[PDB]
Enzyme design. Structure first.
Site, short mmCIF file in Angstrom:
data_model
loop_
_atom_site.label_atom_id
_atom_site.label_comp_id
_atom_site.label_asym_id
_atom_site.label_seq_id
_atom_site.Cartn_x
_atom_site.Cartn_y
_atom_site.Cartn_z
N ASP A 56 0.83 -1.20 0.00
CA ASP A 56 0.00 0.00 0.00
C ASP A 56 0.87 1.25 0.00
O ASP A 56 1.84 1.35 0.75
CB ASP A 56 -0.92 0.01 1.23
CG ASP A 56 -1.76 1.26 1.31
OD1 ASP A 56 -2.59 1.49 0.40
OD2 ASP A 56 -1.61 2.02 2.28
N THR A 89 -4.42 3.98 -3.82
CA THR A 89 -3.70 5.05 -3.13
C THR A 89 -2.50 5.53 -3.95
O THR A 89 -2.20 6.72 -3.98
CB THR A 89 -3.18 4.57 -1.76
OG1 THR A 89 -4.22 3.88 -1.06
CG2 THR A 89 -2.73 5.76 -0.92
N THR A 90 -1.84 4.59 -4.61
CA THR A 90 -0.68 4.89 -5.43
C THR A 90 -1.08 5.74 -6.64
O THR A 90 -0.54 6.83 -6.85
CB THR A 90 -0.01 3.60 -5.95
OG1 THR A 90 -0.07 2.59 -4.93
CG2 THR A 90 1.44 3.85 -6.31
N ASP A 349 -9.65 -4.21 2.23
CA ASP A 349 -9.90 -3.53 0.96
C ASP A 349 -10.93 -4.30 0.15
O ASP A 349 -11.69 -3.71 -0.62
CB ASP A 349 -8.60 -3.40 0.17
CG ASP A 349 -7.60 -2.48 0.83
OD1 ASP A 349 -7.98 -1.33 1.14
OD2 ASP A 349 -6.44 -2.90 1.04
#
Lengths: 481, 73, 481, 481, 359, 100
Positions: A56, A89-90, A349
């Site tokens: 993450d 998120t990346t 997730d």
């Protein structure tokens, strides 16, 4: 001039913008190495020699001692991308970064920052509105949910057993949706054995203290007790009279009290985490009284089957079949503990992925499939806005193409080359065209199952534009007081 | 980065044998003279003064300040 | 500013690969010498000026000061391998390095790291399929038992008595192996005389403390105590009423409790480790009696022989000849602590190997034989599997060539020559063909006796593989100082 | 040797003047880019961890730890500008710094500040006279009076709840208007809820000593008491003989005194802050007296609604409906103390602008329209004065053009170009023409609805000019080590 | 890789534009102190140990090794203005420097070099249009002659005998001028005695036996002797002589500044600035007199818009005065070209940004 | 560029952008905004036709054919040739090897 205090760095003119851009760009490239199914997790070791190994982005940017004032901001972006949505998120970090790159190109040309901002902003709105036209409408369909939850598990460790965990996620999410609530799915990880034994219990899973206490209570009436049972027999007499066959105490139980409890056939456990007590009262419908004399036959939770089976040489207390089938537990059986660490994040997730999938019938073709689309759209939207604004839109579209590029990057294939194929195939097949690295060529993401939630893409552009541009304004920080 | 800290002198291959060989040879030589009826005694001093005149290798190797692995052997 | 804070050593892509691989090579080669009867031990001395002379790789790594991230991964591979079966501790190490070495060479050429893993991971599953088919299943059976135990005793300092250590371990693991457990074996290192004096005692040995007591008790009624015998008459008197002629206290015993136990003709033993108490409760049937008031006659275990032997000139109680002695004691004997250390280190291994038999009869002709076969098979397999993977698969196998390479290495035999010859004779003599160091030339390992456990090899490949793969992914990691 | 102390700096003539100016001109080039709807928020970082990223010059100068006094005064300029009309805090700083940049231009030609100041001062009056000479009188009227308080509250953390905040200031300022005093608006903020829970209380508010006493009084005759009622009977009889019903004690009241006043139906409130005793004596008309022996039926004030309400479990006394509610109490609600001090100021600044619509509702078109006309006017006066000062006049006028120049700058378009076209149409079609940052072209402000209260711009010119004075006067700055 | 050659100093844009202007300006200031009746002489010695204490800009510049290309342009202006009329050889220089000075300021503001060039040229053409409408015409007449000759002998070293030198160039240039030409004048420097011993040798070729205590004094007198002769040539070839004392300049600065007000655009600034250069002339005039330019000019301008053209500056008495009534009248043609040459010089210099020097 | 496709598409497009240097520079040597002018000129061009150019003397996009501004054929043609040709060659030269 002495408006600042001794030792106060000051960014001035283009210098600030430069350092800021490169800054956000650098950290953006470092995190770009873990994007995609071929990504690579990073091992961050703090001072105490700690070793945080995760995939993450957020977590990573939360452990890396960032000294770059800009990067620090890029850390706040990845945060707002993990708290509001989660996965990808990346993706965000890369967008904002690449975005600044396109801008700078223009700034160094002579273009004023303001006009550029308007350009991107003009494309943002349109972009967000395009995602509203390209969103795939489905439903609480169990099939699509399995696809999304599965695609989410992929690109990670459990990518080996996505099929299994995914299924459990769909079920747990289907039994906790009222309006989905993830706080109703207790994630219990245990070592020993393989990660293919993971099961889905519909109750509670605590990790009989005395060897004479029943190892399996049928209609076990839980008599939640918070106070300690030490300095005794009089306290045990008050429980047997209140008809409490299963006394789950939060504090330790006096050795002599366990003998009087087991002599009556009472199943009492000791030292139970406060968080497990509250989960036992909201599932079995029991009342947790502080003192042992405040308990009563009306504060006993109704349980169907409370058995203590070994989950790897360790006997766990299963309190399933509760009167309220809205409280499920996702037991995680796997090899080492460190493995379950990552996996537990995968489910977190997976549940969130399915959660938003049911709460929002949106499911756009991920794997960049959307990126390329929006890009081409803006390219044809810039000639209708013209002015230096045309550039902004274009640049925003070129910045959106970073996702597919990075895909061909982490995969090994030629970034540019692939980009041409995907783009040429996207303007021929539709919005369903994505970058399938497993085949080394652009394919229909909507046909491979590769789907992403609307919330993601939508929220993305939002957090990006705002912050990003703001980083183009702050041309001086100056540390003074 | 960096396997061993600044202190874990790693001697592998041959630079290890050599060193251990040279020292062992030199230590032996020291007593190599106390061999025979007319050996060469050695007044070992313990820093604090006490001088000990010995001709036996053992008594000598037990009263000397040895701080080398291959030497202590 | 600084991308990362101060005191944070980072490495990205190849830059990291080179460092990780390199560090692992030197570490894998360091122990590489500790392979085969040519195993060249090492002397590691920690802060406490403690000299450790061991040939076991695991013992070496767990005593060496490793601070290198990737390098620590090797310590884990040797740790797990040592916890699995023990033998092959060095096998995993060296191999792990070779892999990384062949892989790194693939990247410098332009190959994608992704494919590398895939190719290696795919070949890891193919090998785990070849081994079970090629393996040489053996016959339990004292005849076959000694054969495997005889091939696990060599390559060490006690090779002079490979015949004695063979029968000693053959008797022990053949008196209580229900489902055998390496924990029911207690080895004792007693100084005095050569190892050719080692004996096999059917029970558990320790050290008493009282003289006037019964040194050699017949059918003893052992009573395991843990509570101190300090104040002393009522405590020792309550032990004579139950009929306990043998007292095994966990803590210290009062002098007045000894004189009383010395007057009741009861052999008392103080200062007994916690493990020696548990081993005495599962060998004679004694109950871990906490206090000195609850003991009775049904808590006393039966031990037909509890005499005081002064073998090597050191008193030792031998609780042998019981009803269901589930724990035997290996009485080791050594002229020096050095030889005693090595011997024991190897004894344990054999204990694990035997434990592998009770759960896996299969065995393979070690000495590099199996390695070459897998290399041969895997290579061919690669040619059957098209794609860039064909290169990765063949490279993976080329790694197995490092095992026999090390064999002829620690012997001074030109690898280039011995290897080429080995393969040729191996492609005709099949599996059995291996390398006999004692006589630099190809030879049938199955005939020479050299046979390793199938399960021993199995785990090795998997553990080493998965491990190496991990270290290769994390190609970017700063820290957080 | 050492005249003025040891190790001390010493400037003079061309060194004192030069430094003083540049210092102020520099601190101006720090927030100048923060002027306009396209400003660039800076991100200061104090040596604690508080990263303040604001756009308001004031909050920015209050963070930047200054050393040079010259710059410090600039902080005082923003401290006086934000304390009056709030916004524009930057404008004044920009001008003040510019006036100096042009002044020094004359300091090189050698023109003693005196001859300079005199002009700047006489010119300062020119702008003022012009301002009131071209400003339009916009109507109290709750309708417009609201659009005046709103336009100010806009673009603030309170903007979200502007409408509510606007009315709050509307009612507050519309009540304290007899000449409107802002020192009667007692603001009170309590944590809990949102900014939409705010309201305006008509009376002083205190933060019922007996649970049986009167919780509400119809015609409360308060009696301000400072002394304590502790050691009681005689003291409590001298008050009841004044026909009271509510005794506001500043100190603590004895339990005995609590029964006597409760016995006579008199709500006693012990321990009341001194500040509260002064607000009750000005709104209720109750004279504050020391000892009770000095309490007469004349010092007793009069209210019309004293009810004790629990403003968040905190029973606050409400002495509202005073005879002369000239001092209202604004209850501000905020999520935290940050959104509470922020909202408080926006409301206070709003009260000021509104304090103008009821006293002198004059306002001039923004977009720099005012600055230009004045600049064009002052230029005329220059020719009507001649002499050496003929140039300085122009200098200042040309220094007021910075507002529109820096205005169009933060937009992107040409600053010079727009300036030429500005003065052009501005010299023809009145002053109704100003800079439009959204269209990058000069547009009729008056017709676009862009107007700023005279006062807002009134203080502007006054401050900026006066500033240049005290600075220009600074002859020397010694006093060192 | 190495750009041009080895040791080839080049520049572009700002850096360049600044290098050139700095040189020119400085070169103007140096000689700016040699203007007006307060003109202070200079001591220049060449590689031949020769000392020339001259006050004439042209003489000075043609004695100073000026390798600087950008500066060379200033050497041509003084040379050309000395060939035509002579007087005011420093007027063309100072002005040039100013023009460029107020020009650099414009660019550093954001203006286009071209818009700056257009303006200066537009105003330059305009200025020359106001010159004839302001010039003081005249007709040979020993009257207007001795008057112009007197105002042409001043501002020079031999200003002590402005009366005699006046009669010297009065007779000569009035014996053979038929269409006068200075190619018939032969000045002779005869060291010895003061300057009051000067004589006029008779005649299309008259000899001028000059007397001087020393050499520096000799050259000074002769230098200007040619000034009284050349100026005569001009007048006899052009019946026009504008009023000096800075009068013309101020008015030209008063007309051009307003002319820029009627002509908006980026030209407006350039125009008004162009006129601000003319103010440098009366500035230097006051400069040498040790008077505050800022104050004197402002005052002069005020009264100038009151007393009209005539209004000038009398150094001999710090206060504005009527030049035409004070007997101060320079040559029209003199001022005329000056504005032309200077405006032209500055231009080309600006349009030149790239120069590959060597050091 | 969308026809040829492939990595060439970029090459062609880049070549087109490189050709836009002429108009940009023009506004540069005139005193007008580079990018700003480019937009106006491009917009009008994609409307009137090949007759739209950059008239600095006016500071706005005008019709060259109208104002009388025309360039010979040979000139232009030779420009792109000598350029691209030589230009590319330099790009291939990845080494030179020298001495001192």
């Amino acid at each position: 001039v002495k408006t600042l205090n001794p030792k106060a760095e000051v960014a001035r003119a283009q210098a600030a913008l430069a350092v800021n851009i490169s800054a956000a760009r650098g950290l953006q490239d470092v995190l770009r190495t873990n994007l995609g199914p071929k990504g690579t997790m990073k091992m961050l070791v703090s001072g105490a020699g700690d070793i945080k190994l995760t995939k993450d982005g957020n977590v990573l940017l939360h452990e890396m001692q960032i000294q770059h004032p800009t990067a620090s901001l890029i850390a706040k972006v990845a945060t707002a991308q993990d708290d509001i949505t989660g996965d990808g998120t990346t993706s965000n970090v890369l967008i904002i970064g690449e975005l600044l790159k396109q801008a700078d190109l223009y700034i160094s040309e002579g273009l004023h920052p303001r006009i550029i901002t308007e350009g991107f902003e003009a494309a943002k709105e349109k972009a967000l509105q395009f995602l509203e036209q390209v969103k795939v409408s489905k439903e609480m369909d169990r099939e699509t949910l399995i696809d999304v939850a599965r695609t989410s598990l992929r690109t990670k460790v459990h990518a080996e057993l996505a099929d299994v965990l995914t299924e459990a996620v769909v079920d747990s999410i289907l039994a906790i949706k009222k309006p989905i609530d993830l706080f109703m799915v207790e994630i219990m990880e245990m070592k020993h054995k393989s990660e293919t034994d993971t099961s889905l219990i519909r109750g509670l899973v605590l990790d009989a203290r005395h060897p004479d206490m029943k190892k399996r209570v049928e209609d076990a009436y839980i008599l939640t007790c918070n106070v300690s049972l030490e300095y005794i027999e009089d306290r045990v007499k008050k429980i047997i009279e209140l008809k409490g066959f299963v006394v789950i105490n939060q504090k330790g139980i006096d050795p002599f009290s366990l003998d009087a409890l087991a002599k009556e056939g009472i199943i009492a456990l000791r030292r139970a985490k406060r968080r497990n007590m509250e989960r036992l009262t909201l599932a079995c419908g029991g009342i947790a009284l502080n003192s042992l004399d405040d308990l009563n036959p009306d504060c006993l939770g109704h349980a169907g089957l409370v058995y203590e089976y070994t989950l790897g040489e360790e006997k766990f207390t299963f309190i399933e079949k509760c009167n309220n089938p809205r409280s499920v537990t996702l037991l995680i059986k796997g090899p080492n503990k460190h493995t379950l660490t990552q996996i537990k994040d995968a489910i977190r997730d997976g549940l969130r992925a399915v959660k938003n999938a049911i709460d929002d019938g949106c499911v756009v073709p991920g794997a960049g499939a959307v990126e390329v689309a929006m890009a081409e759209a803006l390219v044809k939207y810039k000639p209708s806005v013209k002015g230096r604004a045309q550039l902004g839109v274009q640049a925003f579209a070129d910045a959106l193409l970073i996702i597919p590029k990075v895909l061909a990057q982490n995969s090994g294939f030629d970034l540019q080359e692939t980009l041409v194929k995907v783009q040429a195939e996207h303007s021929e097949s539709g919005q369903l065209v994505g970058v399938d690295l497993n085949t080394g060529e652009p394919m229909v993401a909507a046909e491979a199952g590769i789907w992403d939630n609307y919330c993601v893409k939508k929220q993305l552009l939002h957090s990006c534009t705002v912050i990003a541009t703001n980083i183009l304004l702050v041309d001086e920080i100056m540390r003074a007081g | 980065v960096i396997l061993l800290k600044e202190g874990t002198d790693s001697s592998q291959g041959i630079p290890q044998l050599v060193s251990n060989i040279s020292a062992c040879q030199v230590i032996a030589e020291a007593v190599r003279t106390t061999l025979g009826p007319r050996g060469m005694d050695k007044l070992i001093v313990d820093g604090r003064g006490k001088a000990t005149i010995s001709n036996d290798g053992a008594t000598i190797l037990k009263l000397l300040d040895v701080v080398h692995p291959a030497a202590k052997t | 500013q600084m991308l990362k804070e101060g005191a944070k050593h980072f490495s990205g892509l190849e830059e990291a690969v080179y460092r990780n691989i390199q560090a692992c090579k030197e570490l894998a080669q360091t122990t590489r010498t500790a392979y085969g009867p040519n195993g060249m031990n090492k002397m590691v001395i920690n802060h406490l000026e403690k000299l450790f002379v061991t040939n076991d790789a695991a013992t070496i790594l767990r005593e060496l000061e490793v601070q290198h991230p990737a390098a620590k991964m090797i310590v884990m591979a040797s740790h797990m391998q040592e916890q699995e079966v023990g033998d092959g501790t060095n096998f995993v190490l060296v191999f792990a390095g070779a892999l990384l070495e062949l892989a790194e060479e693939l990247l410098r050429l332009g190959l994608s790291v992704s494919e590398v893993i895939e190719g290696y991971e795919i070949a890891c599953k193919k090998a785990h399929e070849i081994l079970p088919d090629l393996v040489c299943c053996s016959a339990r059976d004292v005849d076959e038992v000694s054969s495997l135990l005889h091939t696990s005793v060599m390559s060490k300092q006690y090779g002079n008595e490979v015949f004695l250590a063979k029968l000693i371990a053959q008797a022990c693991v053949s008196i209580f192996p229900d489902h055998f457990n390496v924990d029911n074996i207690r080895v004792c290192k007693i100084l005095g005389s050569g190892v050719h004096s080692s004996s096999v005692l059917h029970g558990m040995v320790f050290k008493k403390e009282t003289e006037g007591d019964v040194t050699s008790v017949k059918d003893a009624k052992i009573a395991v105590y843990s509570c101190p015998f300090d104040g002393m008459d009522a405590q020792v008197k309550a032990i004579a009423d139950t009929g306990a002629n043998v007292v095994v206290t966990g803590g210290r015993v009062a002098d007045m409790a000894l004189h009383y136990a010395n007057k009741y003709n009861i052999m008392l033993v103080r200062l007994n480790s916690k493990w020696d108490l548990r081993r005495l409760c599962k060998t004679v049937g004694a109950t871990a009696l906490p206090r000195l008031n609850p003991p009775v006659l049904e808590e006393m275990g039966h031990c037909d022989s509890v005499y005081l032997s002064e073998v090597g000139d050191t008193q030792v109680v031998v609780f042998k000849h019981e009803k269901e002695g589930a724990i035997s004691t290996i009485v080791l004997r050594g002229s020096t602590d050095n030889l005693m250390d090595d011997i024991e280190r190897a004894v344990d291994d054999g204990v694990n190997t035997f434990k592998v038999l009770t759960r896996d009869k299969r065995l393979v002709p070690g000495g590099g034989a199996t390695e070459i076969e897998l290399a041969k098979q895997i290579t061919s397999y690669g040619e059957t599997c098209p794609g860039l993977e064909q290169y990765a698969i063949k490279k993976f196998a080329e790694a197995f060539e490092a095992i026999p390479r090390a064999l002829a290495e620690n012997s001074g035999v030109k690898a280039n020559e011995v290897i080429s010859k080995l393969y040729a004779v191996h492609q005709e003599g099949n599996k059995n063909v291996g390398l006999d160091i004692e006589v630099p030339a190809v030879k049938d390992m199955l005939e020479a006796g050299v046979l390793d456990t199938y399960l021993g090899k199995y785990w090795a490949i998997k553990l080493a593989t998965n491990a190496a793969v991990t270290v290769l992914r994390v190609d970017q990691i700063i820290m957080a100082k | 040797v050492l005249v003025l102390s040891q190790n001390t700096k010493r400037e003079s003539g061309r060194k004192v003047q030069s430094g003083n100016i540049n210092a102020a001109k520099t601190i101006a080039d720090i927030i100048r880019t923060c002027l306009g709807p396209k400003s660039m928020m800076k991100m200061l970082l104090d040596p604690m961890g508080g990263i303040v990223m604001t756009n308001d010059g004031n909050a920015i100068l209050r963070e930047i730890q200054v050393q040079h006094p010259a710059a410090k005064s600039m902080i005082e300029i923003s401290r006086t500008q934000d304390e009056e009309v709030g916004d524009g805090t930057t404008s004044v700083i920009i001008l003040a710094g510019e006036m100096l940049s042009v002044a020094e231009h004359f300091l090189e030609q050698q023109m003693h500040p005196t001859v300079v100041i005199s002009a700047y001062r006489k010119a300062l009056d020119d702008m003022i006279s012009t301002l009131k000479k071209i400003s339009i009188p916009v109507d109290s009227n709750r309708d417009t009076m609201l659009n005046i308080i709103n336009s100010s509250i806009t673009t603030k953390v309170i903007s979200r709840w502007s409408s509510l905040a606007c009315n709050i200031a509307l009612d507050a300022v519309k009540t304290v208007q007899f000449i409107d005093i802002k020192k009667y608006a007692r603001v009170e903020k309590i944590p809990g809820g949102i900014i939409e829970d705010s309201c305006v209380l008509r009376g002083v508010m205190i933060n019922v000593t007996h649970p049986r006493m009167r919780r509400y009084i119809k015609n409360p005759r308060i009696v301000l008491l400072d002394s304590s009622l502790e050691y009681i009977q005689q003291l409590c009889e001298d008050i009841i003989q004044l026909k009271p019903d509510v005794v506001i004690t500043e100190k603590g009241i004895s339990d005995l005194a609590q029964h006597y006043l409760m016995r006579a139906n008199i709500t006693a409130i012990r321990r009341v802050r001194k500040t509260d005793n002064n607000r009750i004596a000005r709104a209720c008309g109750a004279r504050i007296v020391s000892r009770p022996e000095e309490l007469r039926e004349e010092d007793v004030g009069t209210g019309a609604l004293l009810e004790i309400k629990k403003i968040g479990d905190e029973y606050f006394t409400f002495i509202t409906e005073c005879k002369d509610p000239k001092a209202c109490t604004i209850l501000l609600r905020g999520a935290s103390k940050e959104i509470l001090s922020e909202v408080e100021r926006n409301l206070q600044d709003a009260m000021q602008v509104c304090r103008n619509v009821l006293l002198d509702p004059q306002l001039v078109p923004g977009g720099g329209a005012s600055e230009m006309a004045v600049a064009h006017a002052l230029t005329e006066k220059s020719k009507a004065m001649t002499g050496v000062e003929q140039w300085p006049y122009r200098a200042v006028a040309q220094a007021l053009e910075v507002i529109p120049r820096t205005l169009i700058q933060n937009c992107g378009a040409s600053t010079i170009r727009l300036l030429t076209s500005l003065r052009a149409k501005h010299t023809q079609e009145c002053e109704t023409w100003g800079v439009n940052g959204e269209t990058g072209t000069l547009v009729d402000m008056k017709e676009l609805g862009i107007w700023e209260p005279l006062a807002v711009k009134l203080q502007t010119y006054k401050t900026a000019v006066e500033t240049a004075v005290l600075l220009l006067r600074i002859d020397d700055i010694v006093s060192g080590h």
